[PDB]
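Sample 1 of the test manifest.
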Amino acid sequence: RQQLQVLARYLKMDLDNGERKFLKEKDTVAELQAQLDYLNAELGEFFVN
Amino acid sequence: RQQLQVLARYLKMDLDNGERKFLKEKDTVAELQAQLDYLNAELGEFFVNGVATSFSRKKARTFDSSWNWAKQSLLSLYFEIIHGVLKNVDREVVSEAINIMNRSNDALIKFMEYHISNTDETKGENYQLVKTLGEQLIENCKQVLDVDPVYKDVAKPTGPKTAIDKNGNITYSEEPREKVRKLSQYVQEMALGGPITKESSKTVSSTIPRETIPFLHLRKKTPAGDWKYDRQLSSLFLDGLEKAAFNGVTFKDKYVLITGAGKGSIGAEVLQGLLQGGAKVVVTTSRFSKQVTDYYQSIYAKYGAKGSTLIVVPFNQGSKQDVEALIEFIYDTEKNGGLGWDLDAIIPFAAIPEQGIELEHIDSKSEFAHRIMLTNILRMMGCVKKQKSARGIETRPAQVILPMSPNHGTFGGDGMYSESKLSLETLFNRWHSESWANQLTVCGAIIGWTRGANNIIAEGIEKMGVRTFSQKEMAFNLLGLLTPEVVELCQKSPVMADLNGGLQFVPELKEFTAKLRKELVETSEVRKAVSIETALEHKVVNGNQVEIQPRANIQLDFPELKPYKQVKQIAPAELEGLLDLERVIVVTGFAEVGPWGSARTRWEMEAFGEFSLEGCVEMAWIMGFISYHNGNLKGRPYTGWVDSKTKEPVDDKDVKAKYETSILEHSGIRLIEPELFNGYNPEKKEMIQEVIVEEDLEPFEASKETAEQFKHQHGDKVDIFEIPETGEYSVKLLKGATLYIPKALRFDRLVAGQIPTGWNAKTYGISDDIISQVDPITLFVLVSVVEAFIASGITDPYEMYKYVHVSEVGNCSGSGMGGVSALRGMFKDRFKDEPVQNDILQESFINTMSAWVNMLLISSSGPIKTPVGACATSVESVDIGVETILSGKARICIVGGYDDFQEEGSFEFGNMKATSNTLEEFEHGRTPAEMSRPATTTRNGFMEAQGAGIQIIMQADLALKMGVPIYGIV
Amino acid sequence: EQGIELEHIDSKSEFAHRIMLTNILRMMGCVKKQKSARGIETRPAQVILPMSPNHGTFGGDGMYSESKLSLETLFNRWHSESWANQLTVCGAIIGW
Amino acid sequence: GMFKDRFKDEPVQNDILQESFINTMSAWVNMLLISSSGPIKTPVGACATSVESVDIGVETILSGKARICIVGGYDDFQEEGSFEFGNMKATSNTLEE
Amino acid sequence: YNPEKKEMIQEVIVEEDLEPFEASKETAEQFKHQHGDKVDIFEIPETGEYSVKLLKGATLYIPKALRFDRLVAGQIPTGWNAKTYGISDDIISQVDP
Amino acid sequence: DKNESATINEMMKHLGRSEGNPVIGVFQKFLTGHPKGAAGAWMMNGALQILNSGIIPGNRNADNVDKILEQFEYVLYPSKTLKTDGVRAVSITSFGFGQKGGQAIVVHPDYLYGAITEDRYNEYVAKVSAREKSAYKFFHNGMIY
């Protein structure tokens, strides 16, 4: 692990970049889904469908 | 890259796992966003945005202190009559008297009895008048001590009036009706009707003409299914209106839910009537804010009778979630956070306007308005039905007073307004055909032409016998439907009240209205064009008043010195020579620095609620918005105020229009501004965490002394090595070493009473060297002392030494906490090794401020007694200074108190829970201005502030000898 | 819509109301827009509106009566608005 | 405590603020031993606060707002106060001594 | 408090990414709020804790010791305790020395 | 707030105040907030201004007075300013931490001038007029410069 981290630092490689992007997109999914559940609780399952 | 990949494969590490998860979540975002754009293209931007939830239980505001507002109104009326605002008993005074009667009780009777028996009628005719009127009102209130509060409207009825000036100017006024001048006469005219409404001891119903339709009537459903005018129901309604006009109508034990009752609407007048009658009204507002809450508080303080409660709640009638939440909140028990109420009436008058939306233009806004006005109304009645059925209530129906339009598509271009209004008429049949008759009763009020474009022609519509109503008259008609007899009639069967004023009898009402508007508009433009052309002809034929603007003249506001006979009349005759003026303490000066600037500006904001020209100019000068300029400016010579930044000339008239918003936004209680507290953001509060180092950190270059200090601290857990190239040192922390990492704490006290932004001691003239040396609290104290001496008229502090010895002038002011900025310096900045002055400790003392005052301005060698009393340090200072003067070691004293707002003091007050939680306040919908609400049901912490307040006190004998103003006697 | 009283008005009732009133009005509005865009004044479309003689007589039908009764505004809207030349209203009150 | 231990997130009592006031000592005296509702006047005078207290108490008794008074003065030695006195050079340098 | 060894802290700019250290969820959120993009916080699915990894350029406080030259003070005799005079331990914990 | 209303009510009861004559309570911290020691000084400044102007500011944030405060019949809680025809005395009351209760009474300055002669009052008025003019010129000069 230490040697891999040294090589990544030398290569200017961000091992956590993918995870950070994933967490951002997961938050975006959460907020868009919150909007969708609000609209569903509002208009209703029957109306939206 | 290859070595890294080999190591990852050995470690069973998936470098692409994060990217794969990211791409999956990006596809999920794409598909959810596709769903959202479909729903947006479908319902529309307006509908989706407008279905946003607005109601919350924590945001409801209760008003029930009518016992207090009665006394407040009585004193207001008393002083108004005494001062001559009200010379005669006009209908407004009669209405206020009626409200006082409605709130009358034994304590109130005693209040008025004292205030009238204590009144001295010999002090001019005004005092005799107020005494007589108060005696009459006492007699009236004694009668209605036990009588229930009644809604009685005494305003003069007003008709429409449109006049066209010679220059084609349209003016509309609500001039009083010549024929009708009481509500009883209004009801009599309503029963009488007019020629147009005719068709081919004794109540007002008796005066109805034969074979005629009253302007206000009730319709009965014929067996064929059509609604026709009915003599019996109409007579019942007009008799109820007559009783409500003459005796007044009570709404005790009546729980109402009214929506769409904002200012300038029919619902507001209906709410005022309900509050007068004593009802428990839940008013719902879609514009919940400080303005609306203050409006409803004023409405309740004016009209809320004894036993009435006004519940102002935020509410979106366009969202069924808000509808369900509001009905649940109303019906749920107080223990569960509800109101524990059961609605006796529902008035769903909430609607959004629609102009120029024809059939082709029906869109998201029209569908949303239709939801609000039909679908969510039906959902609200369904929710009330469900609550009543769940609680097993069959014998307490809620009266739904439905707003109905006489015209369904007559005017057009109103979207789905007519659709909603016409579909609301299904409820009459649904009441019989469904199983909610026992929980709700339908009362369709067909509201006629009401006057709040549509007003200029109201006079023209009335020339043919049609009747047009005002908001007050329409509210009176609607409240006539809440009388017990009409309620009982609604419980018998659903009722259709026609309050249209005979508007249905005119043929082609839309075209006639358009013709009236076209005639008025054409006359106005023709007259305006002819006047303009005549003016231009006159000017060309005959060839070709200076207006003066106010200018700020700030007054020190010295006390008014009345003539000697006047000032001697009030005081006892035996006081002359009785008192030892050396032993009488007088406040000769005072001043302050606070969230609203100086004492003058703070007083203006306190008393009048807004800044005058002088106050606004003073605030702009204090805040640095305007600087004074004298000399050449852009070539021409200018002398006056200029903008500090742009340097452009600004006139005192423009000072308000240019800086009122800025002054209000950055004065008083408001969100904490980090620029005024050294980048202190309560939302991001810096802390540091101790952790044990787990790996040897990389070397970092450091000085020789710094490296030695690190080695002294960490012992064998750090290593310092000299670099021979430059002589510096490299510091290498090892495993197990102690480290501090910054971390941020989200703190919930975000609002504080802060001195206005741009307040600078340089503006008052304190040198930059003094500013650097002393604390901000000391600067506030210096400014306060200078302003206090200015208010005392002592421009030169050495002028005191012409009258007293240097040992006879003291400073007994102090602080609860002192130089908290210097304490923070010594305790934190020194700990962090930031640049801190070596004398920060002597700057931190509570007596340092008084020391700096004495050794910058006073030079006195008199008594110095700095108190600490926390919030009472100023009364402490006054007491200590009074005793100093009475003991005689001083003759002049500088009393008062000062303190500062800072991060650590604020945080510890928050830990104490003494201050108010700003996040909870936001949850309750409280703005920074209304966080601080002393003596209220919802107060949950004090509002922390900063500043200084100073008073110059002295012996009365000395004050008279120096000829300084005397503002009061301690 | 069966067994949907006032207390039961819900998503299905709102959707049925949309179909039977709001989207009908949108459809006539769209036909009006097409005819106006193509400059057609002398070829109106006859909207044969299905109307109910009974508006809430039976109940328990959600917003059926609301839609049918709000469709009667079109008679006045025809005169009061600027789509008379593109559409003509024919309300057929369908019996049993 | 409030300025450093809270900054370091060490365990600090939530009422360290009232425990820091100069009048807190007099408050605790009154509400542990005296129970008097008589005049409370906590002075600050740096090194002269005790003579200040004697003079304020004398004037309280002569004014008659009190007949008995607890005068005097108190202060504590701590790291930061010591270091700041060293910074001002008011204290004696122990290494020079 | 040792005047010969007076604790201070020095601000330095982090030059390399420090190794992750296990931290609570709230503590990791606080660290992220402070450092913005200069720290990386990741949940550990095994136990639900959080790992906090400071990146290059982050702000760090390392303790350092200052040799202070005021070593002698007038101190109340060692072993002086309020319990000896009878003040309760609860009062001792509540109030200042 | 409850303790202070109770204290004022008990004072007013014991001192035999006429029933139906509540003291009008002025709450200034609704607007200026609560400073930890400038409080009573700001309230004294407000009290002096109330005395000299005859104007009693109202607690505009008093949305709904607490029902618990109704029992104190000798206290009134206005929400809007009152143009009173003269205020004789004002009672400023403060309560700081550490049981620091404090009261002050500010009487109208005009009750002082009844304790002196006509000639003394006239010369005092002349001196105050001259001093007010001097203070005005000083204040405006210092403000602009």
